Amino acid sequence: WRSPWAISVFAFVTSLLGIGLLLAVIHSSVTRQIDPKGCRMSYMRPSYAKLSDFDTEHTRLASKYSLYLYREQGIDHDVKVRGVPVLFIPGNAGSYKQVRPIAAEAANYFHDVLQHDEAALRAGVRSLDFFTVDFNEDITAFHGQTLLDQAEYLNEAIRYILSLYLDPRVSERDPDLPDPTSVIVLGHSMGGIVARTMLIMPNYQHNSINTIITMSAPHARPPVSFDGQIVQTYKDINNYWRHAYSQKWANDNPLWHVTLVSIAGGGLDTVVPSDYASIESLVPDTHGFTVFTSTIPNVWTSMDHQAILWCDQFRKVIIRALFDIVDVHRASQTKPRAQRMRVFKKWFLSGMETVAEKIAPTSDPTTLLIVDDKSDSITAEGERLVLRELGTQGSVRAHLMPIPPPGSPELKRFTLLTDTKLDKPGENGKLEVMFCSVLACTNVAPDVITLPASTRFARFPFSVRKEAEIPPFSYLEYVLDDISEHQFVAVIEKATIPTPGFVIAEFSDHSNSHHTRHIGLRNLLTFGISLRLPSNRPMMSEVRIPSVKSSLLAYNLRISALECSGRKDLFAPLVRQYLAEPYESKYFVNARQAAVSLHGVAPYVPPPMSREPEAEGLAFQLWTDPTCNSSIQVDLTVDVMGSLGKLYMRYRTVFAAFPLFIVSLVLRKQFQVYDSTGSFITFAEGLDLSLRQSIPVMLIVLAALTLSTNFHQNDLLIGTQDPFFLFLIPLIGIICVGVCTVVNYIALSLTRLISVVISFIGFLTVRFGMITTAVLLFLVSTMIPYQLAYLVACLVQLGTLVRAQRISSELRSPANSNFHNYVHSIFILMLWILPINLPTLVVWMHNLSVHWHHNVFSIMPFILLVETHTTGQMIPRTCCVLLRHITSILLLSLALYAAVYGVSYAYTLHQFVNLFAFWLVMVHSTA
Ligand SMILES: CCCCCCCC/C=C/CCCCCCCC(=O)O[C@H](COC(=O)CCCCCCCCCCCCCCC)COP(=O)(O)OC[C@H](N)C(=O)O
Ligand SMILES: CCCCCCCC/C=C\CCCCCCCC(=O)O[C@H](COC(=O)CCCCCCCCCCCCCCC)COP(=O)(O)OC[C@H](N)C(=O)O
Ligand SMILES: CC(C)CCC[C@@H](C)[C@H]1CC[C@H]2[C@@H]3CC=C4C[C@@H](OC(=O)CCC(=O)O)CC[C@]4(C)[C@H]3CC[C@]12C
Ligand SMILES: CC(C)CCC[C@@H](C)[C@H]1CC[C@H]2[C@@H]3CC=C4C[C@@H](OC(=O)CCC(=O)O)CC[C@]4(C)[C@H]3CC[C@]12C
Ligand SMILES: CC(C)CCC[C@@H](C)[C@H]1CC[C@H]2[C@@H]3CC=C4C[C@@H](OC(=O)CCC(=O)O)CC[C@]4(C)[C@H]3CC[C@]12C
């Protein structure tokens, strides 16, 4: 007799190391390598007007959903549309009220700044009208039908909206303005998936949507694979986007005038891996980009799932970008696609990305410099301009630096960096940088890169108190080949009183300023990297480590002091960590120590298609005072504990199905021991025996399968075919031996607790004092979602397990120990399909509040086995070798299938365990 409670020293240590690593991964993911939170709360006056003219006549889903139009209180006094239509699709468990901050800032900007502008009104800027959908806090990620129903409802609403702009009592707008044929769709979370689904739906108007701006939307892969329909919808929307853009002829492309910008909140986003927000595999760079929120200028901060919609810093950047893509003189109320893309690139991207277009070199001359005929400001070639303060000469004066000749073999770059705002043409301010050919001068202001302000008192690139926001530094950068036509670069001081300021401008050879360190990941993970930048270094220097591409490894960056002899630094050192492929850039103001966590190659997303030739891996860009005549040292080491929590977000769904592979192997061992020796061993005796051979060999075979134009290559197993991460198979295997052991002990404790309560109550009433199985089966077969029928079965198998345990304690017979063991093993298998089947219960219950074959074949095999155990029968021991073989093969196939296809096709695991349960029913029927 072995108590069901006993554990072997080998299986306890293996189980505790697994529970110990799951507590380390979770802790190091909540505490280590965490980004700073610079999000500032947004304050607004909210009002929503229900558009109830839309009804069951326009869609049968109108009884279920509603459409509301945001009206900011004090700026909006009628439910009348005067501007361009914008729809916010809320995400999973999201409200229509989450549109509160974005709509409010758009209302307050037109009221305070734009209505007064006559050029902006003339060119076609009108207010934006923000419509929002109440999806009754539906959970789209777990029910595929709900996502499709929402897309159909919104395609109708886009038709009903555009119809309110043709109506005089609900429209108040000018009459030369074409009637709107497009709505701008902003989707948070799964609302960016509902937005793309609409374009593939049968009820979609041809040119209804042109611009989709999604916040934290998982475009690459489904967050959860519990629902099959979600897995197929993604395969249809993802395929539609990739086949459309594959088309050579733009006429064939149905998505030519469409633009998708996928914004992501980065690390602080725990609900959706920001790696799944990447559109690189679906949209060409011409038609969209994925930008993290750390690269966005005027934000420079990672945001949590909800913070993306409620930040004050982010609410300002999206409303400014939208009011620069809108034209009421065009049917679709938007600028053409290539213009829409440049506006999104200037407002959301840094400017140092290589997709940006500098327009000022070839821009027409804007100024007439005649005060440079006198030869007083021209300076020596190779002479770097440094203006420690401005206007010490008491007059508007100039400092003119010659553009070197095009004969340069190396690449050479002009870089200017001034804290002071450069002036735009037609304005007067302290500084004006212009490329002047001899006389004709083009202001370079349109091309200014705003960098966070690194000053000795700065800790963060973002400030959560608006009063303390250090005005951003201006930066200019230009490859010489582009600026060669112009002869000089003139920094004109227009200041006339001594004033705080700094302009350091210099032309640097690319070699001297650019460094690449080629060290293997294995060498960098053992020795780190140290790089001394020489004292005679260009103001901007750029180290690139091509090896660091993974999102699973985190490093620490320690930059040396840069103490200056004599005078102090004009600015503190600024580091920009960045990746080319997913537009994730990070800025460390006044760098000393920095945590390098990057969103690079990611476990299960489509393969990165950039195949960039030289720009790959991680690069840090360092800006320091170049007049300090002192060297700086750069150190990059690996963070072992912080890198382990990087695993928690990427594999926070492999515990739905990988813990099933362990159960199948243990059950297989139990069944083969039973058939050979006639004793059905306990789940803990099955783990010790299985952990000695079958769990190790099957973990070695899954590693072998990994090492053995298709965008679904990374969907199986651990998601990566890189030989470096094969260690993830044992970490995912040993965390499961621990979770699959605890669950065994929890089930045993639950059985014991229920037994003692039934005893206590029997004591309570004793001293002081078949039909149900048939009814439940009838109810379970008839009229309920099969997922609830599975949950009641699991409750009837707990009843059999309690009635088996009590008989086993009272008799202590060999065969009564056989049944308690077998029922526990079957109940333990069933408890592991609940993770995949429990979510459809939540949707059914909450959608029934609003009054809203497969249903039989899927639960009957399990309804029969739970009933053939309420009769006390033990599986007949198992033509004999062939029968025991089928049992084994069927339980080994389940283990292998649950490891390979359980992250992407987890829903199928319910229908594989059904097959096994039917096999058990047939084996029961044999004897
Ligand atoms: C032995 C087998 C297992 C036992 C039975 C099964 C128990 C659990 C099974 C799993 C399936 C059901 C639960 C699914 C999780 C739902 C997550 C969720 O809805 O929540 C997000 C976000 O919440 C999270 O990130 C979850 C973190 C805690 C997870 C705890 C899970 C429990 C696991 C431990 C179980 C231990 C069991 C051992 C034995 C008992 C909120 O979306 P939100 O940000 O609001 O809206 C988006 C946004 N505003 C927008 O607008 O779009
Ligand atoms: C194999 C390698 C990869 C797999 C291993 C790990 C994958 C995960 C596997 C399974 C999922 C585990 C279920 C949920 C865990 C994660 C919860 C979590 O991280 O969600 C926090 C909340 O975290 C907590 O508050 C801790 C509680 C977690 C569970 C602790 C017990 C675990 C029980 C396990 C059983 C042990 C029993 C053994 C007995 C000895 C929400 O994001 P939060 O940080 O609060 O946001 C703050 C904000 N955004 C911010 O900016 O900082
Ligand atoms: C249910 C929750 C608390 C999950 C955590 C489970 C384990 C981490 C702990 C709690 C239950 C414990 C077990 C409960 C009962 C037993 C059997 C007990 O001895 C027996 O009754 C069997 C006879 C024998 O040991 O030879 C020895 C300790 C042990 C293995 C305990 C070892 C430590 C265990 C596995
Ligand atoms: C501990 C043992 C018994 C098993 C572990 C349970 C897992 C099945 C749970 C634990 C953590 C859960 C995850 C925690 C949070 C999320 C985010 C959330 O993602 C969504 O699909 C909705 C978010 C959105 O897209 O808006 C809900 C599913 C998911 C992946 C959960 C799926 C189910 C998981 C993997
Ligand atoms: C919410 C989670 C933690 C589940 C725990 C609650 C249920 C699973 C409980 C509620 C009622 C219980 C049932 C109430 C009565 C019985 C009869 C009992 O057997 C008898 O009829 C008496 C004979 C005997 O106990 O020896 C076996 C357990 C069972 C099915 C119980 C199994 C556990 C049940 C379903």
Side-chain angles (χ1 to χ4, degrees), residues 547-559:
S547 64
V548 175
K549 311 179 289 248
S550 190
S551 196
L552 298 162
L553 291 166
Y555 311 85
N556 294 295
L557 183 75
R558 187 241 318 168
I559 294 169

Side-chain angles (χ1 to χ4, degrees), residues 641-717:
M641 294 300 293
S643 295
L644 236 77
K646 247 39 141 116
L647 282 171
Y648 156 71
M649 182 86 11
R650 269 84 181 170
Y651 298 86
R652 63 109 189 270
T653 41
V654 139
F655 292 64
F658 205 107
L660 234 214
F661 143 96
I662 313 268
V663 194
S664 328
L665 274 189
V666 174
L667 247 73
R668 200 177 60 98
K669 172 59 71 177
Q670 297 198 273
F671 270 98
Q672 65 183 177
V673 165
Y674 177 63
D675 302 345
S676 308
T677 59
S679 63
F680 208 99
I681 62 184
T682 59
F683 195 95
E685 208 182 357
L687 198 69
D688 173 87
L689 277 198
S690 178
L691 258 178
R692 284 159 205 283
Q693 293 177 335
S694 92
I695 290 151
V697 176
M698 237 51 67
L699 269 199
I700 294 169
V701 170
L702 293 164
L705 295 174
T706 295
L707 266 183
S708 99
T709 204
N710 172 0
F711 293 103
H712 285 274
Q713 42 182 36
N714 284 359
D715 67 351
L716 301 188
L717 295 174

Side-chain angles (χ1 to χ4, degrees), residues 19 22 25-26 30 268 270 647-648 651 655 731-732 735:
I19 294 169
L22 177 63
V25 164
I26 289 164
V30 302
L268 292 184
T270 299
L647 282 171
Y648 156 71
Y651 298 86
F655 292 64
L731 177 63
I732 296 172
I735 294 192

Side-chain angles (χ1 to χ4, degrees), residues 22 91-93 139 141-142 188-190 216 218 223-224 226 270-272 305 648 651-657 659 739 743 832 835-836:
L22 177 63
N92 220 53
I139 294 169
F142 301 96
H188 182 246
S189 215
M190 295 272 329
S216 303
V224 108
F226 290 162
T270 299
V271 204
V272 154
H305 213 47
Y648 156 71
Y651 298 86
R652 63 109 189 270
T653 41
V654 139
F655 292 64
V739 167
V743 165
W832 273 116
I836 316 143

